[PDB]
Design a protein around this motif. Structure first.
Motif, PDB file in Angstrom:
ATOM      1  N   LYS A  78       0.811  -1.210   0.000  1.00 64.57           N
ATOM      2  CA  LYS A  78       0.000   0.000   0.000  1.00 64.57           C
ATOM      3  C   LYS A  78       0.847   1.264   0.000  1.00 64.57           C
ATOM      4  O   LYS A  78       0.359   2.323  -0.415  1.00 64.57           O
ATOM      5  N   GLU A  79       2.099   1.177   0.460  1.00 62.48           N
ATOM      6  CA  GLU A  79       3.003   2.318   0.350  1.00 62.48           C
ATOM      7  C   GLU A  79       3.355   2.623  -1.102  1.00 62.48           C
ATOM      8  O   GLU A  79       3.322   3.787  -1.516  1.00 62.48           O
ATOM      9  N   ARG A 121       1.593   1.660  -3.652  1.00 62.04           N
ATOM     10  CA  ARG A 121       0.375   1.518  -4.439  1.00 62.04           C
ATOM     11  C   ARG A 121      -0.160   2.854  -4.940  1.00 62.04           C
ATOM     12  O   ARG A 121      -1.374   3.017  -5.104  1.00 62.04           O
ATOM     13  N   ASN A 122       0.738   3.817  -5.183  1.00 63.80           N
ATOM     14  CA  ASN A 122       0.414   5.079  -5.856  1.00 63.80           C
ATOM     15  C   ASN A 122      -0.515   5.965  -5.035  1.00 63.80           C
ATOM     16  O   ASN A 122      -1.111   6.908  -5.556  1.00 63.80           O
ATOM     17  N   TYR A 123      -0.635   5.674  -3.744  1.00 68.80           N
ATOM     18  CA  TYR A 123      -1.446   6.454  -2.819  1.00 68.80           C
ATOM     19  C   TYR A 123      -0.551   6.929  -1.680  1.00 68.80           C
ATOM     20  O   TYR A 123       0.208   6.136  -1.111  1.00 68.80           O
ATOM     21  N   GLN A 124      -0.645   8.213  -1.352  1.00 72.70           N
ATOM     22  CA  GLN A 124       0.220   8.813  -0.345  1.00 72.70           C
ATOM     23  C   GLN A 124      -0.047   8.175   1.014  1.00 72.70           C
ATOM     24  O   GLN A 124      -1.178   8.207   1.511  1.00 72.70           O
ATOM     25  N   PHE A 125       0.998   7.587   1.606  1.00 75.50           N
ATOM     26  CA  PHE A 125       0.966   7.085   2.983  1.00 75.50           C
ATOM     27  C   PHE A 125       2.190   7.679   3.675  1.00 75.50           C
ATOM     28  O   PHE A 125       3.271   7.084   3.653  1.00 75.50           O
TER      29      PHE A 125
END
Lengths: 122, 187, 87, 79
Positions: free
Chosen positions: B93-94, B96-100
């Motif tokens: 999820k890091e 996965r192109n989404y800001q975390f």
């Protein structure tokens, strides 16, 4: 299988001189070392007399001490045992203590003439 | 070493039994030159005389941001269901192109995400409410009182230990305000 | 009192330095008072040999002497009590 | 605090060599050499700024009193 591809590869990769292409050229000469000690010997001479780093002669020695030519390995180690401006060429890492471990490896029961082992210990 | 072992033995003996034992040795064997080391006449006299007190003291060698809060809570919850330190829904999820932006350990909010994960994992234990029932804290003011008194007593003991440590620290500051600054010698 | 009850035996320190940075083995002190090292300035002495502008790391313990080492270079210690070691 | 001042840097001691020697404890973010404009060699100090206090503390404790190319380096937690 033909030196043209490897030579041109390393040449166009030496277009610049960042850390890249060293991990190609050094192992390229290392693989060339089989069936001919000339590529490894001349490439090791050129490296240890070439672009500036502490680990150049280190990788050259790691490739040359495993070989059946110990003159080239201890010759890289001699260019290191001068160092010409830098006592601590590595510091807490030791390559002259490495030369002494190589001296013990040669003092191993191979040349028992009671001359070379004592000369290497001296 | 005969005479050396004799002196060391007399030293252990006197350290154990007392200076009256030295009197006993001397008055029993004044006629043998073996206990002359107990008498002033044998040059080992003072050596044994020291070794006695030394083996008595124990030195000589014996003879041999509400959206951000929602996101942090969601991260703790979705990591509660992972299988290992690398087997979660956040490792990929890091990337996965989404800001975390909380998983980084340089960001102090990693401590807040770890605290949310600690709370979720303390509520997802067998006593957290999965398949068991809490009844001693849920209808037991007696158990609640035992726990409250134990917490207050642990707090009092922690404060008392802290006060002991603080007195030690003040004593160390005073002992540093009094150290030797003229008897300088390098070895 | 911390200056008035100061014992005077002065045992020679058993210190080993290392460029990896020092460790001293001393006799059993028998007190929780921590042996502490610190920097002192190169002016103070008894006869004051000249040419001093340097600092020295001196570690003082109570019954073990102040192990001093000049530091010409231009809570980070330890005190292990079961083997009598300072670092 | 995660900034270590390595004082006494050698004549050829660059931020690259200092960061290469102190990086394996943790990823250094920033390097600063206050450059002597009249001499072009550092005045004996380099600044390395890493992420974690653990890396900065362990470098401060382990490379303190070290040598790099023959200079007696002083690695301290900066102020």
């Amino acid at each position: 299988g033909r030196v043209t591809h490897t030579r041109r590869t390393f040449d166009r990769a030496l277009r610049a001189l960042p850390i890249t292409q060293h991990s190609r050229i050094w192992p390229l000469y290392l693989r060339f070392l089989r069936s001919h000690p000339l590529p490894e010997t001349a490439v090791r001479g050129y490296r240890r007399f070439l672009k500036l780093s502490p680990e150049s002669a280190e990788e050259y020695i790691e490739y040359l001490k495993s070989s059946d030519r110990l003159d080239e390995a201890a010759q890289r180690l001699a260019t290191v045992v001068n160092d010409e401006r830098f006592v601590s060429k590595a510091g807490k890492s030791n390559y002259q203590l490495w030369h002494e471990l190589c001296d013990l490896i040669s003092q191993n029961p191979d040349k028992v003439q009671s001359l070379n082992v004592d000369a290497i210990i001296r | 070493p005969e005479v050396r072992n004799i002196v060391d033995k007399t030293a252990s003996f006197v350290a154990r039994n007392g200076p009256e034992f030295e009197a006993r040795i001397r008055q029993n064997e004044i006629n043998n030159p073996k206990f002359n080391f107990l008498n002033p006449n044998d040059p080992y006299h003072a050596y044994y005389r020291h070794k006695v007190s030394e083996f008595k003291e124990g030195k000589a060698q014996e003879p041999s941001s509400a959206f951000d809060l929602d996101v942090v809570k969601l991260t703790a919850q979705f990591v509660a269901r992972n299988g290992r330190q690398f087997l979660t829904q956040l490792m990929q999820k890091e990337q996965r192109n989404y800001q975390f932006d909380f998983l980084r350990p340089q960001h102090s909010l990693f401590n807040y995400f770890t605290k949310l994960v600690e709370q979720y994992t303390k509520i997802l234990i067998p006593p957290k409410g999965l398949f068991s029932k809490l009844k001693k804290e849920a209808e037991n003011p007696r158990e609640v009182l035992d726990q409250v008194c134990y917490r207050v007593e642990w707090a009092k003991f922690q404060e008392r230990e802290r006060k002991k440590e603080e007195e030690e620290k003040e004593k160390e500051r005073v002992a540093y305000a009094q150290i030797d600054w003229h008897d300088f010698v390098v070895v | 009192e911390v200056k008035k009850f100061v014992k005077i035996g002065r045992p020679g320190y058993k210190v080993t330095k290392q460029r990896d940075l020092f460790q001293i083995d001393y006799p059993e002190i028998a007190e929780g008072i921590m042996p502490r090292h610190r920097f002192m300035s190169a002016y103070e002495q008894r006869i004051e040999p000249p040419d001093r502008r340097w600092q020295y790391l001196l570690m003082a313990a109570e019954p073990y002497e102040t192990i001093a080492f000049k530091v010409p270079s231009r809570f980070w210690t330890h005190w292990n009590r079961e083997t009598k070691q300072f670092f | 605090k995660r900034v270590l001042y390595v004082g006494g840097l050698a004549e050829e001691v660059d931020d690259k060599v200092l960061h290469a020697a102190f990086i394996p404890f943790g990823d250094i973010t920033d390097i600063q050499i206050p450059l002597d404009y009249e001499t072009e060699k550092h005045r004996g100090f380099a600044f390395v700024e890493f992420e974690l206090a653990e890396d900065a503390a362990a470098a401060i404790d382990n490379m303190n009193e070290s040598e790099l190319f023959g200079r007696t380096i002083r690695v301290n937690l900066a102020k």
